[PDB]
Design a protein around this ligand. Structure first.
Ligand SMILES: Nc1ccn([C@@H]2O[C@H](CO)[C@@H](O)[C@@H]2O)c(=O)n1
Length: 196
């Protein structure tokens, strides 16, 4: 299975389909797809676990990537059985997701805590507990709670998209630390990112 807090499973949350691919709620997909491309990890169809998944080497470590294809609020129906089958403990899991409570261009590595109202995380924490790592990709908040669906299911304006893209790019460069178990250093160096 997994080994200590070397990250060996990286999950990106999002919704399937071209209609959702550019929406803010797919920030985790963006990160994992870009990471897969950087390291040459093939993301292939994985019907058994209701997702797309891959396995390959990141910096000398065997890592698995997962994009649930369940729709966001059923993400645990992919992540939980996958992690159980491969014997990956929460402490070895990184979940990338959009974060309403942070600005575009802000990114943070967090360990633990609740779902913060994120309905993908809400589907995962009850099963595996909170002690997985999160890459919180700021997307901003619409202001009101009745607007949250329109915000997360919206396509950001170009300035906000550029700010998210730069943050995601920065985080990609820090995955080496994570797969090596250097979570403190990764946290410091990811959380210090500024866009300008
Ligand atoms: N055909 C496409 C076009 C874009 N994207 C993703 O949407 C973000 C915003 O355009 C991009 O940053 C990101 O690539 C996608 O996944 N597939």
């Amino acid at each position: 299975g997994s080994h200590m807090s070397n990250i060996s499973l990286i999950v990106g949350l999002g919704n399937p389909g071209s209609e959702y691919a550019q929406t803010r709620h797919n920030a985790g997909f963006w990160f994992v797809e870009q990471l897969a491309d950087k390291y040459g990890i093939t993301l292939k169809n994985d019907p058994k676990f209701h997702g797309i998944s891959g396995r390959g080497n990141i910096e000398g470590h065997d890592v698995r990537l997962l994009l649930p294809m369940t729709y966001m609020n059923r993400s645990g129906q992919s992540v939980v059985p996958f992690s159980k089958f491969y014997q990956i403990a929460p402490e070895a899991i990184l979940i990338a997701h959009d974060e309403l409570d942070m600005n575009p261009g802000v990114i943070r590595l967090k360990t633990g805590g609740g779902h913060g109202g994120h309905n993908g995380l809400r589907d995962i924490v009850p099963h595996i507990g909170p002690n997985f790592h999160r890459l919180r990709i700021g997307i901003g908040h619409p202001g009101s709670k009745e607007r949250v669906s329109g915000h997360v299911l919206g396509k950001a304006p170009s300035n906000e998209q550029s700010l998210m893209d730069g943050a995601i790019d920065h985080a990609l460069s820090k995955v080496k630390l994570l797969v090596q178990g250097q979570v403190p250093q990764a946290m410091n160096q990811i959380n210090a990112y500024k866009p300008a």
